Swiss-Prot record:
Designated name of the protein: Cytoplasmic dynein 1 heavy chain 1
Domain remark text: Dynein heavy chains probably consist of an N-terminal stem (which binds cargo and interacts with other dynein components), and the head or motor domain. The motor contains six tandemly-linked AAA domains in the head, which form a ring. A stalk-like structure (formed by two of the coiled coil domains) protrudes between AAA 4 and AAA 5 and terminates in a microtubule-binding site. A seventh domain may also contribute to this ring; it is not clear whether the N-terminus or the C-terminus forms this extra domain.
Superkingdom per UniProt: Eukaryota
Quaternary structure annotation from Swiss-Prot or TrEMBL: Homodimer. The cytoplasmic dynein 1 complex consists of two catalytic heavy chains (HCs) and a number of non-catalytic subunits presented by intermediate chains (ICs), light intermediate chains (LICs) and light chains (LCs); the composition seems to vary in respect to the IC, LIC and LC composition. The heavy chain homodimer serves as a scaffold for the probable homodimeric assembly of the respective non-catalytic subunits. The ICs and LICs bind directly to the HC dimer and dynein LCs assemble on the IC dimer. Interacts with DYNC1LI1; DYNC1LI1 and DYNC1LI2 bind mutually exclusive to DYNC1H1.
Disease listed for this protein: Charcot-Marie-Tooth disease, axonal, type 2O: An axonal form of Charcot-Marie-Tooth disease, a disorder of the peripheral nervous system, characterized by progressive weakness and atrophy, initially of the peroneal muscles and later of the distal muscles of the arms. Charcot-Marie-Tooth disease is classified in two main groups on the basis of electrophysiologic properties and histopathology: primary peripheral demyelinating neuropathies (designated CMT1 when they are dominantly inherited) and primary peripheral axonal neuropathies (CMT2).
Family: Belongs to the dynein heavy chain family.
Protein function: Cytoplasmic dynein 1 acts as a motor for the intracellular retrograde motility of vesicles and organelles along microtubules. Dynein has ATPase activity; the force-producing power stroke is thought to occur on release of ADP. Plays a role in mitotic spindle assembly and metaphase plate congression.
Location in the cell: Cytoplasm, Cytoskeleton
Residues of the full protein shown: 4594 to 4646 of 4646
Organism whose genome encodes this protein: Homo sapiens
Amino acid sequence: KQSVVTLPVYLNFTRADLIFTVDFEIATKEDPRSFYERGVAVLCTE
């Protein structure tokens, strides 16, 4: 019920279908700005 990086989850590689969102913990020296710029996401099928 109750930094941090949020990543979309897509069903296939084309990223045309969004299922749900996942919040991940970022490492010490990494950058959420870079993570958002690089288009990091989660795919269900590949």
